[PDB]
Amino acid sequence: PPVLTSKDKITKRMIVVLAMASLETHKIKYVLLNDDHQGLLKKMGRDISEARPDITHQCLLTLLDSPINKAGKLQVYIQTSRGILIEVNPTVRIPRTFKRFSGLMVQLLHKLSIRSVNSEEKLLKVIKNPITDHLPTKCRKVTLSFDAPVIRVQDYIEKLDDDESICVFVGAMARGKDNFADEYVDEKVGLSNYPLSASVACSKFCHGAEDAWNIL
């Protein structure tokens, strides 16, 4: 299976943007701003929703362990709360723990790239705004939301064309308004009558696409 890059715009695929990500560093050797300093936030003048790497961590363990990424139709773009924009290679290994995750995010955010451990490849990249610069040419854009009406994944992805790709916009934050992509979408979409997490919604779009695109 070929590896997908942003240089191609033609291949119909699945793109997820984990937007409004909680990625902040702190000096005390930099760590991610979180257990470790959950009680040192206002004491240092920082926020609580800024202390949530587990959401983005669990969404990367969600998306990058999916079968459809092993099928090779998935691209992950991660957008922080400041606008730091990240291309994630589909062949990257997430460290299964919190610590190597933390140090790898620090070396990512300050080296601006984490290159291949084996070859001449970029593993993680930081790119420029807007996000519309690096998505395929004819692509529907939607936003998952509790407050947007419920659709099924399978029939809706089966409305797509031969070249028409799909990118979805997922809020990887604690709470708040579902308006982080009002500039971007054609459509606000929903999946359940119950308030949904980011990771379980991403999983429903994954396996809904796998039942949609005959991926087993």
Binding site: K7, T137, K138, D182, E183, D186
Partner: protein
């Protein structure tokens, strides 16, 4: 362009000044959106683009997207530029240029 008007004279003769002009016309967006401020939340507003701009954008998307496709492959500038003129003079929605015309109009229609 001296090579490209040989290639278009070879492939599907159609005297090659024909295939340029139709690629000028059939890539032009017939409407556009502007970023009106409005106060904080920028509405986009469906507006009708002036025909001096419809000439000029048609020059832009052809010459850029051909060099984008000619970036890192066996084919050259003139060969991929020959691809863009044929695939846009007949509306085929296969070229880079035709896809950008419809993507703007489906924004203006969705937001008029």
């Amino acid at each position: 362009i001296k090579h490209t008007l040989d290639i278009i004279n070879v492939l599907t003769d159609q005297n090659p000044i024909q295939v340029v002009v139709d690629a000028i016309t059939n890539t032009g967006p017939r409407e556009d959106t502007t970023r009106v401020g409005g106060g904080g939340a920028a509405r986009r507003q469906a507006v009708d683009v002036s025909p001096l701009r419809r000439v000029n954008q048609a020059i832009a998307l052809l010459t850029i997207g051909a060099r984008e496709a000619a970036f890192r492959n066996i084919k050259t500038i003139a060969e991929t530029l020959a691809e863009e003129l044929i695939n846009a003079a007949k509306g085929s929605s296969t070229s880079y240029a035709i896809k950008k015309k419809d993507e703007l109009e489906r924004v203006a229609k969705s937001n008029r």
